[PDB]
Amino acid sequence: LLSGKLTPAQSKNPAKNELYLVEGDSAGGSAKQGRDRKFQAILPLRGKVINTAKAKMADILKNEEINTMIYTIGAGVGADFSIEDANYDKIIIMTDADTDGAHIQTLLLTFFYRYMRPLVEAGHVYIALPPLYKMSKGKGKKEEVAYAWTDGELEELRKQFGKGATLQRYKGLGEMNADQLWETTMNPETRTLIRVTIEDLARAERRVNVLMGDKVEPRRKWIEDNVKFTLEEATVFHMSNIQNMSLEDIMGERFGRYSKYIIQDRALPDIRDGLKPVQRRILYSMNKDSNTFDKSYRKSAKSVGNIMGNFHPHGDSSIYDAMVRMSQNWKNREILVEMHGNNGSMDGDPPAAMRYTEARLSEIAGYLLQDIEKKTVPFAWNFDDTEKEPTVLPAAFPNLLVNGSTGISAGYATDIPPHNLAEVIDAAVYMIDHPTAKIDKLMEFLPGPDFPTGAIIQGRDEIKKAYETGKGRVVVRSKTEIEKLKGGKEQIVITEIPYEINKANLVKKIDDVRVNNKVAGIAEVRDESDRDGLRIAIELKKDANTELVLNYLFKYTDLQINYNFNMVAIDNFTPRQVGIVPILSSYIAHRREVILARSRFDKEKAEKRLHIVEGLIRVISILDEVIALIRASENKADAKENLKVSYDFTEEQAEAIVTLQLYRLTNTDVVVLQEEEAELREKIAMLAAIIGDERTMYNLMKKELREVKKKFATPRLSSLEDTA
Amino acid sequence: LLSGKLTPAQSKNPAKNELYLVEGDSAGGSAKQGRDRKFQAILPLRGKVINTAKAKMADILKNEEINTMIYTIGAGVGADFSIEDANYDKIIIMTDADTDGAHIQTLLLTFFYRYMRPLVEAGHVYIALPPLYKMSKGKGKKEEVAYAWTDGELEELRKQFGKGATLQRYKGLGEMNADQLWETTMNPETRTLIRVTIEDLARAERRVNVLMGDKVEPRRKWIEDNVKFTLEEATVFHMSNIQNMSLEDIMGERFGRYSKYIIQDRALPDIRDGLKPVQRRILYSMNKDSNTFDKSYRKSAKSVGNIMGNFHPHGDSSIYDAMVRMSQNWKNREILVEMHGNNGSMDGDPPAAMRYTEARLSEIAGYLLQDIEKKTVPFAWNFDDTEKEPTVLPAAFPNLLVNGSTGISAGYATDIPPHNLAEVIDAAVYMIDHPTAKIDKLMEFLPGPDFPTGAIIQGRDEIKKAYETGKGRVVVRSKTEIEKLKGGKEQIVITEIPYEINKANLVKKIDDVRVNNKVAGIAEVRDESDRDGLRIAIELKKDANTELVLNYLFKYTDLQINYNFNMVAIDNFTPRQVGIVPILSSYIAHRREVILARSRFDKEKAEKRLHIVEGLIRVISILDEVIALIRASENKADAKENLKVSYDFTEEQAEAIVTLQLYRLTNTDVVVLQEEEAELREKIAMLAAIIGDERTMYNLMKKELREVKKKFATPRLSSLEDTA
DNA sequence: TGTGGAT
DNA sequence: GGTTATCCACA
DNA sequence: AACCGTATTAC
DNA sequence: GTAATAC
Ligand SMILES: Nc1nc(-n2cc(C(=O)O)c(=O)c3cc(F)c(N4CC(O)C4)c(Cl)c32)c(F)cc1F
Ligand SMILES: Nc1nc(-n2cc(C(=O)O)c(=O)c3cc(F)c(N4CC(O)C4)c(Cl)c32)c(F)cc1F
Ligand SMILES: [Cl-]
Ligand SMILES: [Cl-]
Ligand SMILES: [Mg+2]
Ligand SMILES: [Mg+2]
Ligand SMILES: [Mg+2]
Ligand SMILES: [Mg+2]
Ligand SMILES: [Mg+2]
Ligand SMILES: [Mg+2]
């Protein structure tokens, strides 16, 4: 069932037949249609393939995707491998040219390297190179078949026999249809491969183990050492026909691309605005579509589709799940999406599909985006270069800490817990006035996490270590109480539980203790949570030792868990483990660039308007003259020229004058224009003051953060205790 | 697997317990969250329940959702059924306030009448009753939430001292949060129910057997008699807590409600433009989003999502499948959507999902929308009154016959085959000139269908009967030829096959014949189809009987099939069986409304412009006064007045004068404006003539159809034959 | 059997 | 990203 | 519309 | 034996 299905070739012929291993069933469709059916076979691969150098060995044979791969090859596996039993001469890996494409290239080549080495050794394993670009100056002129793999090959296609043409930028084999696929990547004549070889069994064995085995730090190190986080990778210039390449440099090249991408652009939040790229995109798109808190809800599907076609070239479920998460107030301390309908529960029951639900940005999420229009924040091109997207949001509140971030990259993970908005702002304000402020002091203002699930946080000294180093283990325990019953009889009653825990799975594990009678005294386990409150009720027998039970539960269930801080985020393009200080200063530095840029923006604006008001005031005093002059001019350009020569209007002033609608001659109040002149001069002064004086700027940073606090502050939810 | 999964209630109190039956798992969850877990259980339904008449038993008693329905209630199957054993004292059917809500209500009430009567007579089966509207908005501490079931209760809530606060118009249970759901339709206190009774076994064995039994024609008849297509049905006002209705007026209203909707607004094409509503909404949406043939492709999920949030409240796969079909050139004779990627194949291998594919309208699809921006067509309010959509498209070509339509409805279906564009035009064009033209005459121009898949149509008479009455059975036969082989051998070479036949499945069924040796002579079946060409070779044994084989294949496989014209369409809102004539006159009448409407639009434009230009030419001669006048005036609107009163300009002319930019005063060339008068006056003449002179109009209708023909004509694909 | 818009 | 059900009318 | 797999870090 | 963005 769980394997991808095989489409054979028509002819049994080991000497020239090909098995295409294709990324995903959709692309298997296109491959199955563009193929030559007599010597080309197809096995679709169902997303990410197992790791045969992490996962076990019973696992590796239960893996259906593997078993069907071994089957179809018809050679045997590892210690039973015969090369002349094999049904194909070429095993051809063919993936999207996305970076997960690279990840799959990686994952296969290990399996094969490890369990089919003579097949790798005899150079039977290849890789298909799909194109990146397509060029057409036709469609009823004729067409102009033209493709490109390198930005260099593309720049060559500014020639060909036509211009003003199109350039389709491919994002998968999904977007290619049979004819496109045959020519470009499947037809022996035209297609372009690479053969995978073994140059050095030492240097190539080594490369795999580090990259693909479960030692995380040699991997982190390989990434530290090899990956350029701050640089591009001016790629190879695509040799014709086939091209030999070491397993070594491939597992290298490919895993470097995958590692880098998921570190920078997937699983790790940016240190300033606290968003993963997918989440930033949700916010930006839903903002641009005016899907804000003040206006109407909006079908989730519409939202998700726009996000996927404009910014985020990934699956719809990835986006809907991300959007939905931002809407749940047991995951986010401050929700960035409001959403009508079923957005799940704490029992983790599935949210309603995006066809049902509807949604819009939360009020506070407007503040992450505040002043994005005012050139505060560096924009870059979307995946196809139709449209720009922000690399980071203004962030008028310190989201990273408030809402935290839990993610898993390559060579790195991250747990940052949520915090109280007020508390986080208090620290930051202090640090604005005290650059060198140290933990002990900051912790007067930010004592610890504030989970939206509430609960009891235990381990003040481990908080400190996490706030210093970025790592530390703290304890979270459910809010419990006792209640009496008839028959005397007590019952334990749970109202808050640990963050990231599934209520139904917890109730079940508890009840499994009762059933297994691991600790004497439990009668019934009842979930009594209605829509308004959480309320698990553990009912004990007649004279049960209330507190001995409670203890086994904490110990041996998830009624108590340890939260583990591992605070990683992206500083200056790079993954970084970080405590409260770099986080808070990073933010402050960010708000500084924003307030400064917003001020320059607003100021250049105000000056233009001033220069015009200046001109319009003068015009009124010579209005007859100005009109007679426009009447005596030949055209628009002439008039402007006359106005400058005869009256010294600037270009800007003349253009504005020349384009006043006639009805504007009704409003000629010079007193009212003067009032406006005053207001502009003052605005410019205030804005020049900010730009001119760090402290004038910092005091505004603080003024704003205080307003945000006042507008959005809510009580702590999790109580802090010291002993553990 | 398969069946909606049960969520038990906490204590077994069959005195007061309630099994809620909820349309879908997404709403199932919402109900779960919103319930009182003590005495309310939740069985969700996975959409359409089996019909308990139609579906004959054994299939019924393995139907997973049915098993898990009887299991739950813990009573039995009418005969063994025992009210006293039952786990619930109310079975409450809860469905979307939608029209499939109605169909599902309908489907269940058969199962209860027909295998569980005692529950229904006793009054233990109830109904749902979600609200249709929610009103108001007034901060946080709110002062402004009330709901609404009827149109009548809307006037009620519009009345609130404050201002006009915001209105939600619910589209199902998947847009309702669990508080909203408990409070409005699940709390016994506040909820409102319909108790289902049996008020005469007689009038609810006739009513339940007509509506849901095998005989189409009584149901067709019932609808024909009872259902008012051209008329609304807003009636029943909302009463006190519980209300009574009989199993008659429930069945009646609900299946009537349903059948109306899916006859009109789903499964049957409109006779003018040949479109089902989803297809028209696809076109109109994509078109309005500038997603046209001339601009570049665009992610499918973006198009689909905008269709669903704007026009079509239904499933994304229902929408995407329709879109994919319109792109498939073996289902449509003139594709309306161009889709890049895996858009299926003839073997019916699944198309890539909407995240992979991208798409835009074909060029000819633009001709269905031609002149839509010129008030050429009635528009309605969309499903939530945020936007407007066309009830019918301009249809600059006769799409209904050209692409045909295959649909299934209630007490009605529709098979219309596709025709060749050029031939359909030729017949319409003749019939413009000869309204009383007979079939034999039209059939000179339009002899029979033209399938995209081609093949051989045999049966001139039944073609003629279909073209007369709307019904008729024709033979579609695959195109074949015989090819010699090595050493006294033959093979059959299939090169075209019948419309709607999956090639893979056919090749399968032919191979199965060989395997079982139903007829003798078959060596091998080889699908030799590739990207460029269709080619099935059936390779015969030495001295087999090519004829006996072939004719056995035509007979017992789908290498030849029967096509049954069942030409049904919507004419004046009612379903109607039609032949060529009422089809072609429907179109000609439409193009008439369109050409006229359009011409009035373009003429209103040109008069406005002309009048303005008159006013401008005048203005020159009083320029100094107009200027003096406009400076004097207190404001814009004031200065317009003074222009009218003082100088005798229309509103139109004054508004244009008053919004001239100052630089227009440089232009005193009346001559260019006079050439423009001239050209405008001529244009208005051409236009007004079309409006005044029926023939002038028709000659245009003809000119234009001829242009379409010439631009889009393609050779016939199916050959015709007359008898065998 | 299977068509094609729906749950 | 495959997979699994139902309804509806008509061979 | 639920249900199934994988990579990735890290308890 | 789970978290959360990806195939
Ligand atoms: N056939 C293919 N499927 C997937 N894929 C995508 C999912 C998504 O878009 O969210 C998903 O949720 C998903 C779940 C699965 F359980 C799953 N598998 C069960 C096994 O059969 C594999 C797979 Cl594979 C899944 C893919 F990304 C690519 C595919 F080709
Ligand atoms: N859970 C529910 N699912 C459906 N539903 C919707 C589908 C769609 O919108 O494209 C679909 O393709 C689909 C396929 C199925 F095979 C299927 N079933 C197999 C059985 O488990 C039912 C169901 Cl049910 C299906 C529904 F319309 C409503 C639902 F609640
Ligand atoms: Cl101005
Ligand atoms: Cl003008
Ligand atoms: Mg991809
Ligand atoms: Mg998924
Ligand atoms: Mg524990
Ligand atoms: Mg609905
Ligand atoms: Mg479906
Ligand atoms: Mg037949």
- The DSSP secondary structure of A329-360, one letter per residue, reads TTT-SS-SEEEES----TT-PPPPPTTT-EEE
User: Are the beta carbons of A368 and A587 closer than 8 angstroms?
Assistant: no
Q: What is the phi/psi pair of residue B564, to 5°?
A: -105, 100
Q: What is the phi/psi pair of residue A563, to 5°?
A: -75, 140
Using alpha carbons, select from A378, A89, A66, A40 the residue that is nearest to residue A187: A40
CB of B46 closer than 6 angstroms to any ligand 2 atom: yes
Residue-wise DSSP of A452-468? TT-EEEE-HHHHHHHHH
Cα(B395)–Cα(B380) distance, integer angstroms: 18
Angstrom distances, CA of residue A172 to CA of A175, A296, B320, B645, B704: 6, 35, 19, 67, 42
First vs last C-alpha separation in chain B = 50
* Interface-testing mutation among A318, A524, A525, A531, with chain B (most B C-beta atoms within 10 A): A531
Does residue B282 sit in helix, strand or coil?
A: helix
Inter-residue long-range contacts of B422-428, CB under 8 Å, 24+ positions, other chains counted: B422/B709, B422/B712, B422/B713, B422/B714, B423/B447, B423/B450, B423/B716, B424/B398, B425/B397, B425/B398, B425/B705, B425/B706, B425/B708, B425/B709, B426/B709, B427/B580, B427/B584, B428/B398, B428/B584, B428/B587, B428/B588, B428/B705
Using alpha carbons, select from B404, B677, B676 the residue that is nearest to residue B567: B404
The structure's method of determination equals: X-ray
Using alpha carbons, select from A416, A364, A435, A691 the residue that is nearest to residue A588: A435
Does residue B339 sit in helix, strand or coil?
A: strand
Using CB atoms within 10 A of its CB, is residue B569 exposed (0-12), middle (13-18) or buried (19+)? buried
Using alpha carbons, select from B132, B129, B102 the residue that is nearest to residue B251: B102
SS3 track for A171-236: CCCCCCCCHHHHHHHHCCCCCCEEEEECCCHHHHHHHHHHHHCCCHHHHHHHHHHHCCCCCCCCCC
Q: Which two tokens stand for residue A225?
A: 């050492």
Q: How many CB atoms lie within 10 A of CB A379?
A: 14
Cα(B611)–Cα(A607) distance, integer angstroms: 42
Nearest-5° angle of CA A354, CA A357, CA A358? 110
Residue-wise DSSP of B383-399? TTSSSEEESS---SS-H
Roughly what angle, to the nearest 10 degrees, separates helices A216-226 and A247-262?
Answer: 90
Angstrom distances, CA of residue B327 to CA of A117, B281, B348: 45, 15, 14
B536-540: strand order across its sheet:
B479-484, B490-496, B536-540, B522-527
CB of A2 closer than 6 angstroms to any ligand 1 atom: yes
Q: How many CB atoms lie within 10 A of CB B448?
A: 25
Inter-residue long-range contacts of A229-238, CB under 8 Å, 24+ positions, other chains counted: A229/A260, A229/A263, A229/A264, A229/A573, A229/A574, A229/A575, A230/A572, A230/A573, A230/A574, A233/A257, A235/A150, A236/A150, A237/A150, A237/A152, A238/A129, A238/A149, A238/A150, A238/A153, A238/A192
Residue in the block written with tokens 């901060």: B139
DSSP conformational letter for A662: G
Cα(B598)–Cα(B377) distance, integer angstroms: 9
Does residue A504 sit in helix, strand or coil?
A: helix
Residues near ligand 9 ion, CB 5 Å cutoff: B 317
Residue in the block written with tokens 């259980």: B41
Q: Which positions ≥6 away from B463 have C-beta within 8 Å?
A: B443, B447, B448, B449, B457, B472, B474
Report the half-sphere exposure of A189 (CA within 13 A, side-chain side).
5
Query: What is the H or E stretch that residue B167 is in?
Result: strand B167-169
Angstrom distances, CA of residue A417 to CA of A268, A473, A494: 14, 12, 22
Residue B139 falls in which region: left (phi positive, over 0), alpha (psi -120 to 50) or beta = left
Q: What is the phi/psi pair of residue A214, to 5°?
A: -90, 25
Cα(A617)–Cα(A620) distance, integer angstroms: 6
Roughly what angle, to the nearest 10 degrees, separates helices B421-433 and B580-620?
Answer: 80
User: Are the beta carbons of B618 and B610 closer than 8 angstroms?
Assistant: no
Query: Is the Cα dihedral A436, A437, A439, A442 positive or negative?
Result: negative
Cα(A309)–Cα(A90) distance, integer angstroms: 36
Q: Which two tokens stand for residue A79?
A: 């210690």
User: Are the beta carbons of B94 and B173 closer than 8 angstroms?
Assistant: yes
Residue in the block written with tokens 């995109």: A281
DSSP conformational letter for B50: P
Helical segments of A621-669, H only: 623-632, 636-647, 651-658
Query: What is the H or E stretch that residue B465 is in?
Result: helix B460-469
Nearest-5° angle of CA B295, CA B296, CA B298? 120
User: Are the beta carbons of B670 and B615 closer than 8 angstroms?
Assistant: no
Ligand 1: which of A32, A46, A312 to mutate, most ligand atoms within 8 Å of CB? A46
Strand extents, DSSP E, A61-169? 90-94, 125-128, 133-136, 147-148, 166-169
Determine whether B170 is an active site residue. no
Give the torsion through C-alpha atoms of B610, B612, B615, B620, to 10 deg: -100
Using alpha carbons, select from B95, B119, B115 the residue that is nearest to residue B51: B115
Does residue A95 sit in helix, strand or coil?
A: coil
Q: How many CB atoms lie within 10 A of CB B5?
A: 13
Inter-residue long-range contacts of A555-560, CB under 8 Å, 24+ positions, other chains counted: A556/A513, A556/A518, A557/A506, A557/A509, A557/A510, A557/A513, A558/A498, A558/A501, A558/A505, A558/A506, A558/A509, A559/A477, A559/A478, A559/A494, A559/A497, A559/A498, A559/A506, A559/A510, A560/A475, A560/A476, A560/A477, A560/A478, A560/A498
SS3 track for A54-70: CCCCHHHHHCHHHHHHH
* Strand F at less than 7 A from CB of A56: no
Q: Which positions ≥6 away from B190 have C-beta within 8 Å?
A: B183, B184
Amino acid symbol at B66: I
Angstrom distances, CA of residue A376 to CA of A393, A397, A588, B611: 9, 15, 14, 49
Strand extents, DSSP E, B198-253? 242-246
Structural domains of chain B sorted by starting position, each given as residue range(s) with its CATH number in brackets: 5-246 (3.40.50.670), 263-469+567-602+692-722 (3.90.199.10), 470-566 (no CATH), 603-691 (1.10.268.10)
Q: Which two tokens stand for residue A405?
A: 């971030």
Roughly what angle, to the nearest 10 degrees, separates helices A99-115 and A201-212?
Answer: 120
Distance from CA of B515 to the nearest CA of A (A): 18
Distance from CA of A594 to the nearest CA of B (A): 31
Cα(B398)–Cα(B707) distance, integer angstroms: 13
Query: What is the H or E stretch that residue B21 is in?
Result: strand B18-23
Give distance CA B261 / C1' C5 (Å): 13
Amino acid symbol at A445: F
Roughly what angle, to the nearest 10 degrees, separates helices A623-632 and A636-647?
Answer: 140
Q: How many CB atoms lie within 10 A of CB B348?
A: 12
CA A100 to chain centre: 14
- Cβ contact A353–B26 (<8 Å): yes
User: Are the beta carbons of B700 and B690 closer than 8 angstroms?
Assistant: yes
Cα(B158)–Cα(B136) distance, integer angstroms: 9
CA A7 to chain centre: 36
Residue A358 falls in which region: left (phi positive, over 0), alpha (psi -120 to 50) or beta = beta
Cα(A455)–Cα(A497) distance, integer angstroms: 6
Does residue A481 sit in helix, strand or coil?
A: strand
Using alpha carbons, select from A33, A249, A222 the residue that is nearest to residue B352: A33
Using alpha carbons, select from A310, A303, A279 the residue that is nearest to residue A385: A310
Q: Which residues pair with B408 in a beta bridge?
A: B413
Q: Which positions ≥6 away from A273 have C-beta within 8 Å?
A: A280, A368, A392, A393, A394, A395, A399, A400, A590
Cα(B693)–Cα(B715) distance, integer angstroms: 36
Using CB atoms within 10 A of its CB, is residue A11 exposed (0-12), middle (13-18) or buried (19+)? exposed
* Strand F at less than 7 A from CB of A102: no
Does residue A711 sit in helix, strand or coil?
A: helix
User: Which residue minimizes Cα–C1' distance to E9?
Assistant: A413
Q: Which two tokens stand for residue A440?
A: 């002990």
Q: Which of A33, A172, A297 sits opposite B345 (nearest CB)?
A: A33
Cα(B281)–Cα(B319) distance, integer angstroms: 9
- Cβ contact B665–A356 (<8 Å): no
Report the half-sphere exposure of A308 (CA within 13 A, side-chain side).
29
Q: Which two tokens stand for residue B58?
A: 């054994």
Using alpha carbons, select from A296, A196, A320 the residue that is nearest to residue B26: A320
Q: Which of A177, A340, A631 sits opposite B175 (nearest CB)?
A: A340
Q: Which of B172, B303, B353 sits opposite A26 (nearest CB)?
A: B353
Number of H helices, E strands in chain B: 25, 25
* Interface-testing mutation among B169, B179, B355, B631, with chain A (most A C-beta atoms within 10 A): B355
Angstrom distances, CA of residue B606 to CA of A547, A593, B286, B673: 90, 54, 29, 14
Amino acid symbol at A60: I
Q: Which two tokens stand for residue B138?
A: 């007034």
Cα(A181)–Cα(A176) distance, integer angstroms: 6
Nearest-5° angle of CA B144, CA A323, CA A22? 150
Cα(A402)–Cα(A446) distance, integer angstroms: 11
Cα(B414)–Cα(B407) distance, integer angstroms: 5
Q: Which two tokens stand for residue A482?
A: 């006792």
Largest CA distance in chain A: 107
User: Are the beta carbons of A476 and A498 closer than 8 angstroms?
Assistant: yes
Roughly what angle, to the nearest 10 degrees, separates helices A651-658 and A636-647?
Answer: 130
DSSP conformational letter for B266: I
User: Are the beta carbons of B355 and A354 closer than 8 angstroms?
Assistant: no
User: Are the beta carbons of B48 and B103 closer than 8 angstroms?
Assistant: yes
Residue A348 falls in which region: left (phi positive, over 0), alpha (psi -120 to 50) or beta = left
Angstrom distances, CA of residue B478 to CA of A196, B47, B455, B498, B596: 47, 38, 5, 6, 45
User: Are the beta carbons of B718 and B451 closer than 8 angstroms?
Assistant: yes
CA B92 to chain centre: 31
DSSP conformational letter for B621: T
**Strand D nucleotides within 7 Å of a protein CB:** 1-11
Using alpha carbons, select from A67, A76, A127 the residue that is nearest to residue A247: A127
Amino acid symbol at A234: A
Residue in the block written with tokens 């960035």: A336
